[PDB]
Symmetry: C7
Subunit: 207 residues, 7 copies
């Protein structure tokens, strides 16, 4: 096996035990609560807007004839403050599930290959949600810089009505994407639960 | 753990509702949209918007966006989003129908993964549509901004009208694709549903 | 599962699509094939001297110690001929795709070979669509690039290379647009031949 | 569904016309071309001993602690020789492609080996077309890059490296354009040999 | 003579790796999980992260604009941890590769295990190098953000994003520690459970 | 094969090419292999102190509380470039020659005796990999002048930054090192081609036998 | 077989023999000396800095209230002059090992495939080392242009402290990377020795021709 000190084995163990308890806690209590909590958030009015013109923020740019203070969209900011911590907390939980399943990978042995193949499939699935979640964060970072460059272009060049029209469009595009984000996150949490739950037997001992 | 059940049951009802009522209605509704005149323009020169940029002479006002395209965009744009949403719904549905990974009877699960990868390919194309729409406003904006700043170059003017034609053609292709996508999903799921619900039997 | 409204709504479209595809294959495709090959005969697409393509460039030459700059009319007139042909094919590619996919049967273990034929024809049509979309991005590339070319040539009057490239873009576009028609003809022809020769298996991969 | 008397006859006229075109190209055109460029390779403009003779005058005032700058004539004259050769091959690549694809038979389980030969020759011709299109993007790269080079060299007079590179681009272009002719000769030659030696199997993969 | 100089390094490396695996790794695993307990890394209200901006609001030249202190203090904690792991990844790599035997036709399975563990460690190094490029991205991006916000005072979205970058950095830096803990943990478990086969893929004794 | 004396005229090219390739392989290649390895002995390519490479910069240093003269190129690098640059082009040309040669030796695609043709394709893909690397060298050379130019242009415009000045000298060192590696590679490439073709020539000329 | 001119066969042989001697010389004498020499460099204080704040170079940019010549970080420059020639010399030796192993590839023959497979594995490994070492050169080139653009931005916009902090950060980022470089280079030389040494038997004759 592996060489270890009397102190070194105890400090490996405390973490291992703490992690396993964390994962078993997350799977049983946290995940079902979260699944519901965001589906309940999806009921809230800010995420179910009928007329997308109500999203539109005031622009106050002087129309030319043949600059003051331009505020950011409040509605999107309030929405962002709701979805944004949810993205981060899932990414964190993805890492937790990954650390968990990998500590359940046994000694690479020629006997009984099928069991370990299941573990690798569940693991590659969790990695695929993490990848998508990280793709969400890069969509959020894309919003502020792009809306900023949009209003900066619209104010500098007052004569072009297309620059003005895109700023409102970015807000609609962000809104729609942020709505899709919650649905995805709900589906991701749901997907993880179902894949792990149904296969847990084999996941804990592939042998 | 009965708090997980309400969602599961609610989702299954949602998916079965979408497949039976929503999808056929949508399929028709956009094919009916394709009949409307705004999407079947004979002369593409009628699309062209006024430009009002002063021509220089050898020794600016306000430039409006294309109304016709804006009105068209307001029709296709919510259709793109609603499909992307339904793609997620179908995905969540099929994945909850994936059984315990078991050595017995591999063939059934292989069918589920094929239908799933197909829906993902539709979502990928739909997300490619949204990035085409986002590309329109910034590109037409930079086009008129360049055309107004440099009045002497007439190809800058000619491209603004070209972007509108390029957008129109793309937006027309979008509806056809969306119709085909909804149709494709229905047919793939319907014909295989038997195996999709229980790959094991 | 089916409902009273759903039964009708799916069938009408299905029947309408099949009729559309069978109509396209029999009448439209042969007519197109000829119509563009007849276009290829026209003089605007068979220019001997490419210097005749060259458009006037109104730029003052500097001396050692600007007005209107119009686009190339000849290319514009050519573009108005090829451009709708690119779009109409892309549309027909989608039609053929929707058609073949509605002919894909239940995924079944019995008789795998037939379905393999369907997927090959389908991947071929997708490869044609990919090339057609590559044509549209070549057309979009022309106006922005010729624009930046004349804008650079006017701003910097001293460089003769900028002036030389504007005329070169027009020649490069012309040659590409000529290649486009040839390709489009070949694509329509290729589709007809692949579908026609295999239609038997395409409609029923299983038999009976 | 069988086609009308005018419909299939119009599919036939093109088919027959294409086959005649391809058989004409293979027998007469290709050998003539192969020689014609190899004869071009003999010409002095393409075999320059001293590459400093390529160098064009720059006339930019040296600073102490602008007029109009002409393009390189020698390269322009060379370009006018290689450039139509690139386009004409790209066109012929499309012709060979349309030809071989009309020779692809019904996808059938019997005798797979023959069709595999057809696909190999076809993928080879596609690889030649890809390289030819890579040549056109090298030519387009020349004018914009030499233009930006002289524009930078004139704006910032104090830096010699800008001036040095303009002459370097011309040498880099020359060398590339020389390699282009060799490649085109080799491509035409390669096509002839691959098609000629395998023609038997190319026309009928099934045999008989 | 040449073998004597290769030997000292070889022996020194093996001792280093065996030292790292037994003493260093478990201590590190704990030390950062203990860091994760600290308050600077568990902030409830992310608005407390927000740094003062002092840019004059226009009405219908510029003062000194400092960087965020809270992020700087956090960076000084995560940043040396990223580098030290990258270093240890190289150490494990050098170790396992010196344990690769003569390529021989007999008993292929054992060497296949070694290559799998090795490709895993390389994947960890790749992710760690992706972390360094995220840190380098922070300063240049926050800099361009405040530079844009000061130059164009009128546009709020520039000012709002500077605070957003700090939140985005914070969240990423938090994820970094979690990942690093998981990486160290993952390496220990993969090596420990397979060590037998890792030292001798062939199976020998003397 | 319907008409024309021009079939005796695809023969002239074929024969001319084969003679060219056989000439290149026997006489040219060994001479080249040596000639560059002899170049590698020359002092300009074996510089001890890389500070001797450094070219004068003459940019006025600012003073804390005035436009530049003429800024020459690095002569040492220019002289080196004039030696490596024609060698890169001549190899790229010879790669095309070897390619045209081996492809004319590919026989009728036939089911009988597959192994022989597999050898031909391996040698061919190898020569293509050499050409790819040689074309990567030309794009490194083109990168030098534009990058050194933008470097001095930035250094002169902004006099106050010493790192802009420092990188110009660094590009010259980076170019030198790369150009040295280039000749080593070219020697190795010529050597590699000779060995791969020579040892396998038997199978390369007739993959079938007979 | 291959046809040869008397002069050409002499000219092919002299190089062949010279290369083999070079490679055998490199493997036996150079490589062990290098392995040690850098690991001895790793002991030196400039590469083992406790406080990374000591790396920080003076910036002299006037703080605004609501010019000058800015020198390059000497410490990094002195470090660069140490690692930089080591990167180049390894890249050169990678080419040498490659030329060597490829001249040991025999006639492609159907008999005894296993031996040649070993040669290709060692070769692809050396190529992977060369790739990483070319990735190091592009990291070094990245340093000067990036630090330059950093101080140029920091001087132009005096009011933004983030630009000023990043310049010091690049130096720390470079230092850490340059430290990792030496470790990697040591590991690369070591890795090459071990892979070649343990397999040399098969590397010289994959066919198992009697010694």
């Amino acid at each position: 096996g592996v060489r270890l000190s009397g102190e070194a084995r105890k400090q490996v163990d405390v973490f291992r035990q703490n992690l396993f308890q964390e994962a078993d806690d997350f799977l049983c209590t946290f995940l079902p609560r979260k699944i519901i909590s965001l589906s309940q958030l999806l009921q809230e009015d800010s995420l179910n807007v009928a007329d997308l013109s109500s999203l539109r923020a005031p622009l106050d740019i002087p129309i030319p004839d043949p600059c003051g203070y331009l505020p950011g969209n409040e509605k999107l900011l309030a929405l962002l403050a709701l979805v944004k911590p949810e993205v981060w907390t899932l990414k964190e939980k993805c890492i937790l599930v990954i650390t968990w399943i990998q500590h359940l990978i046994p000694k690479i042995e020629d006997g009984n290959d099928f069991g370990v193949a299941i573990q690798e499939k569940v693991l590659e699935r969790v990695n695929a949600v993490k990848t998508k979640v990280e793709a969400f964060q890069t969509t959020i970072s894309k919003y502020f810089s792009e809306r900023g460059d949009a209003v900066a272009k619209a104010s500098k060049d007052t004569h072009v009505m297309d620059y003005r029209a895109l700023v409102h469009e970015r807000d609609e595009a962000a809104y729609g994407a942020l709505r899709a984000m919650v649905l995805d996150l709900r589906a991701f949490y749901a997907e993880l639960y179902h894949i792990i739950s149904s296969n847990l037997e084999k996941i804990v001992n592939p042998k």
